[PDB]
Amino acid sequence: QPGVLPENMKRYMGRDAQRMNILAGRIIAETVRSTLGPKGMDKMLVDDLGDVVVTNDGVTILREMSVEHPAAKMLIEVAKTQEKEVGDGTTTAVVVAGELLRKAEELLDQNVHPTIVVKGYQAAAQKAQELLKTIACEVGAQDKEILTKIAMTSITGKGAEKAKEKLAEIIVEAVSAVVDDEGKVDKDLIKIEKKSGASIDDTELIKGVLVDKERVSAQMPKKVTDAKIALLNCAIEIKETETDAEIRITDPAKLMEFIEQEEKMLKDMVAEIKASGANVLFCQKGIDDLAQHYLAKEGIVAARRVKKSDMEKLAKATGANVITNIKDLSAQDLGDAGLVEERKISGDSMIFVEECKHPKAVTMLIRGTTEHVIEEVARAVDDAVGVVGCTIEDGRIVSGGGSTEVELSMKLREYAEGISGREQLAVRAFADALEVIPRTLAENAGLDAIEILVKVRAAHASNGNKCAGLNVFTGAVEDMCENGVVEPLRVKTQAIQSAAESTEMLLRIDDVIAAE
Amino acid sequence: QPGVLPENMKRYMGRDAQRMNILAGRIIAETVRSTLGPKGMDKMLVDDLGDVVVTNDGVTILREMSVEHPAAKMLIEVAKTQEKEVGDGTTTAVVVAGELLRKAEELLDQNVHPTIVVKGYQAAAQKAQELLKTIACEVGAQDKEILTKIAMTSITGKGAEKAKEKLAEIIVEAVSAVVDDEGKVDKDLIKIEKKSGASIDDTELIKGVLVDKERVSAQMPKKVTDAKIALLNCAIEIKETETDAEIRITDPAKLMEFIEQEEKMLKDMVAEIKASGANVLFCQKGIDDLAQHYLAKEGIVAARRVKKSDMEKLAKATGANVITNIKDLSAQDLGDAGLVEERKISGDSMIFVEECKHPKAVTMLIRGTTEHVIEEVARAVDDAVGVVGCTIEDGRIVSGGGSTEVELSMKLREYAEGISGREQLAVRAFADALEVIPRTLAENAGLDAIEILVKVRAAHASNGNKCAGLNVFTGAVEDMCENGVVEPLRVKTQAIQSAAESTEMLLRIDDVIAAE
Amino acid sequence: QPGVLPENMKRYMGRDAQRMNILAGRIIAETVRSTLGPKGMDKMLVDDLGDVVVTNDGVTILREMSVEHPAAKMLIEVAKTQEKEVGDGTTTAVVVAGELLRKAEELLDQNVHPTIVVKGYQAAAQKAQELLKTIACEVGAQDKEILTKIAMTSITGKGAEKAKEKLAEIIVEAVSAVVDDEGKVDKDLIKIEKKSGASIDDTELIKGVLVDKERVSAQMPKKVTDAKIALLNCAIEIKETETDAEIRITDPAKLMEFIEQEEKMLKDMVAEIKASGANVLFCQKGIDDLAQHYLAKEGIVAARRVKKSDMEKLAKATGANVITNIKDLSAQDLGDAGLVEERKISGDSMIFVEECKHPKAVTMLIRGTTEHVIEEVARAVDDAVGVVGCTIEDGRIVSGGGSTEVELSMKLREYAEGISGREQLAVRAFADALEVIPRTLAENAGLDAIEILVKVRAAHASNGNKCAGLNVFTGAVEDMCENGVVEPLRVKTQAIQSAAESTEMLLRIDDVIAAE
Lengths: 516, 516, 516
Ligand SMILES: Nc1ncnc2c1ncn2[C@@H]1O[C@H](COP(=O)(O)OP(=O)(O)O)[C@@H](O)[C@H]1O
Ligand SMILES: Nc1ncnc2c1ncn2[C@@H]1O[C@H](COP(=O)(O)OP(=O)(O)O)[C@@H](O)[C@H]1O
Ligand SMILES: Nc1ncnc2c1ncn2[C@@H]1O[C@H](COP(=O)(O)OP(=O)(O)O)[C@@H](O)[C@H]1O
Ligand SMILES: [Mg+2]
Ligand SMILES: [Mg+2]
Ligand SMILES: [Mg+2]
Description:
It is classed as chaperone. Keywords: double-ring, protein folding machinery, group II chaperonin, ATP binding, chaperone. The entry is titled "Crystal structure of Cpn-WT in complex with ADP from Methanococcus maripaludis". The structure is cut from a larger assembly and holds 3 copies of chain A. The first copy, chain A, is α+β, with helices and mostly antiparallel strands. Chain A folds into 3 domains: 1-139 and 396-516, GROEL, domain 1 (Orthogonal Bundle), CATH 1.10.560; 140-207 and 360-395, TCP-1-like chaperonin intermediate domain (GROEL, domain 2); 208-359, GroEL. Helix content of chain A is 47%, strand content 17%. The first copy, chain A, has helices at 15-33, 58-64, 70-85, 90-109, 114-135, 144-155, 164-178, 254-275, 289-297, 308-318, 371-394, 403-417, 423-434, 436-444, 449-460, 489-507, and strands at residues 9-13, 43-46, 52-55, 137-138, 190-196, 204-206, 209-211, 223-232, 280-283, 301-303, 335-345, 348-354, 362-368, 396-399, 468-470, 477-479, 486-488, 511-515. In chain A, the strands form 6 sheets. A 6-stranded mixed sheet of chain A has the order 7-12-11-8-9-10, sandwiched between helices. Strand 19 (509-515) of chain B pairs parallel with strand 2 (42-46) of chain C, so a sheet runs across the interface. The site of one magnesium ion has 3 residues of chain B, from loops.
């Protein structure tokens, strides 16, 4: 009598399961296609709270639409990974994924079994990775001209693109500055600050850091040049034993003596600081109001309760050692900056620590007229920082504008010739799926995809040009490398690998069991 | 401020409109594919009232699912037309239609504009009609051997197929009998009766008609041989003027005289009937109880209030003229039958009018153990009656089992070679769409569609055999004409034309506006 | 204290009123733009009952969306009028109207007062009517080649366009046949019948009429050649005085005598009919069952209770006089038809009265696979019948494909040069508004409107070609007159006048007061 599997449950099997997933994928892909490339357009997303995000950024859009559909969630993971590993090409990856799903449907409607499609995809994907390596050009991690093209390509189609030359130079300087001694780039050592102002061109690089604290006492200097900075993360307050201790006073005179002893301990703390040669002081903990006095009388700029993250970046920029024992503070622990100034910026008072010599962290101060405008500039700067970092780390790049996908597509078909059996249809499918990129670029530019594809495919055939792609302005096939349209090899390798792995995962599903 | 278009309304534009329709079509198609062919399976459909229909019949299924979706409704119209014009191939037509929609999607995703797809389809469809004429064989409307194969093919895969030889012979006799003098077949002159009994083999042809009435008075004979039948659709009651008239009686004696005068009028009516030589009488109106008496005294079998439809078929079978004036009833108006008997059949008393000489209407009495079993036998008999009728009328047939579709497909591709431009992709699409039939046949038989298609396509290429199709039992390509697997040209021509016109109609839609 | 004007009321003044109307107009226009021209697309409209309409037809769409917005309702009236007066160009007229509203907004945002805009529009419109007369070519009401181009142009872009040559010839024959002796065309004498069948090419012209009634008695002939038809709209039943009358019978013998007298009156009625020479009889009233007998004995085909509208059209086709006194029926009242046949069509029995000699009414029998497909063919046939009628009546045509609007636009700008003052801006606005047609045609064809407009405008400038328009296939400016793309002058004159009058009406509104 009673039901075995839960009654409160929907279930989709075989064809229905496949359709459910394929459909979800395609629909996710279709909602971001319009954003792709130079003539890409932006979405405005409103949440249930009435908050607005306007952005071109693929993965951002996908996160902000609060998608519940279980298969869509899988595709969105593709975009999230692309973001983590590369920082660019999120839309590309998702769109390729959707296309693989769509091409898989044609094969499944012919009765090719899912596992065979999967097998075929896996083969094509491996081959694509191999081909992508032969396709990439080598570049040096210090080739600023090429790094700058990498950044500018990233910003193309973003609306921040109006300022792409200036932005790219700044971004290339910034990333170059924080490259560690193992040759790696930590996106975190480039602090992004966002502040309203006259325009986007007011955006600047700061060799140093911005600190959202003010000097602890107005009697201290507001400005100081060639400063010797002290980083202290112990507190400048009267020290207190760990074991519970209480004073007992029985003589009225001894009353003052304890107060005075405490005042002296504090005076001594400041004197030890002065002795190191420091004129500027950032402290992670608190500073007794009396110590604040003494510091000011010594002409020392001090800030209290500085964010741990701030101390860590201040250290990186100036060469200072964060100290936990005032007793052990020497001149060798002090950091150095050309200028430390408290000044206002968009009506906020902050402490600028700038003109450091060889900073290991820096600040990109992004400026624009309005908050939402800035936010999007920032999102674009993030994309560029990403790919510039990838290039510096990998030393491998490829041409953009769909050229690489077409070359890939063309070679994969050659590969498919030698595949025997049904698996072959899957390999050709995979090949054809890649052309979604050059097609969408044209589509978004109001061009005719079918004919441009014909033209671009031709320029790649024989022993033609792997760099040939559609210029969505002139309408001609051009040499994208010569035009400076390039991207890190890592964008393509990741996007394709991600799309392949996730669609293979979905195509293996023959049963969906949803609850509640 | 206020909304222009109604607020209580959903709307789907461009891509969304196309998907909505394409999807609906495909889903309708997919729900009947499983029924197609020799290894086709049946659906059991339950309505909101708890009534059951189990059937293989495509259009029946689609009517019984109470489909609300507006695009689906359009596809269902394809099945309904096929039923009206042919009586068979409803599943085929719907499945082809779905396939055309699916192939259209691939072209639309490449950015081929809908109107171009449409144009292409129209071309292919016209070409197909031309090709179908050259593909058809001629047959004579009196070729019983070929007509019998036509019927048997129809019944294959129906469960009534257990009795297909017997059924086919009966069906062919039946249709042959009602062919008019212009060579046309009216499916209506073959009355189908359904009655439970020992088995389906008890099913028989009746040269004559079954009447659901009993003789009007038990004093009349139950049986009568070589009968002279009278058809009267005026009433045997006392006649009454149209102008209002009343009798006035003032003399007591004249009281009887009026009653007697009426009795005489009735006696005279019967005597006029006897004088024509009639021993059996069917009357469309009523018969005064006194006339019933006189008729019985004269040994005349009479039935009253016979359905107009019954009178009309009785007339067609026996050669009688339905008369409206008893005065004008002569022996030349009488019909003839070998046997008129009232007898029981499944516990029901009815009047059999059988063994007529050259009947122009006839009765197929269908027998089976249970109601739902009979119903389906009947549905199959209907299909066969249809195609036999089509063959007799058209004189053109083609080979079955997917052979004709494959030949069509192959030729249409040849045609497409000479199409310049984008329209060509649509023509090839159309061609490939047709192969859904041979694919589904194999699929339903658990065979591998991809390889059998390869084999069948090969048998058709060069100057091979237009009759080559997959035998879903042996697994081989065989000569379907030699195996007696044939269908009226009209089933292919209509199915294809219907699918083409309705999918073209849908593909022209770019906006869906639904209310409430 | 209490409110003066009703409290349950919204109100929009000045700017808000203007925006409300302008907006409504534009939105209505925008919903039908997509349907315009050769590459136009169709909408699928679902009502609250779940009934579907799929159509390209502008005014049909606007009627089926149940639009409540008060200003939209006004624009819809534009479409309805175009339908009544012309039968084609409904979309054109509505789109022009929207455009006038949009161009009016630009002028209102510059602070040009509404009345001045209005004044300007009125001037432009009057000028346009004058210019349209000089632009039109003359044609003879019997120039079948030109009438045929007119029809084909009409059907272009409709999906019935697949059969446009055949359809056009039939339509031209049909309209030509019903032209009266004052040279006018009543669209009502061309009866449209819709019946499913093998395909749209089965569509045919019937010189005569279809009657949905079967012969009254099966004993009558089903077919009859060179028939003499009798039209009777009195009844063939026993006549009854107006003054109340009753028979009194006192003698039993006189009983029969009254019945017989009535039978004789009926026999006499039939005999009088036979005497006129008639073999076929259509009666608007009833026919006594006994008369039906006598008629059949005389070999006369008769139908009873024929729709008044049917009698009227039967008369028009055959040359018969509908008679109300059987006594006064002579041979000169009889009509003539080559063939009168009762036969089946899509499983329906009807009476065909065809092959009449010089019919003054005819039937277009439209055929297609499915109901919704047919409906739309019919809608297109209606459009063509309309413009063919217009041409025959007016004798004036103009070139299509936007050429005329461009010529108009160009001349109206010339006119505006000599307008002094602000009114001038309104005249140039009007001029520019007309270009919405050539723009939308291109747009719908995926072409670039801005550049094609530049090209077309050039071909018209100087003393160029008034017939020059965009070919939306080749992409070139071509001679639309040479390509046979033509329309009745009435389509442009009415569309423009309608748009002008209704937008002027709306622009005069400064206050909207809505209730409830
Ligand atoms: N100047 C250009 N011309 C053509 N294509 C370009 C140009 N600049 C960038 N692209 C292409 O646009 C695509 C990336 O666009 P974008 O909207 O940033 O998507 P994603 O989120 O996937 O990076 C890449 O194929 C890139 O090569
Ligand atoms: N013996 C057979 N072998 C292969 N195919 C057959 C055979 N008999 C019938 N068919 C095919 O089955 C199809 C019709 O199957 P059916 O289930 O009746 O569908 P429909 O409702 O479309 O007629 C036709 O394509 C016909 O060629
Ligand atoms: N072959 C053609 N080439 C270009 N334009 C055409 C052609 N045939 C018709 N047209 C144009 O299409 C327009 C009519 O389109 P249609 O969708 O019927 O709208 P409407 O309901 O307003 O008549 C007219 O401007 C006519 O000139
Ligand atoms: Mg990018
Ligand atoms: Mg069948
Ligand atoms: Mg039109």
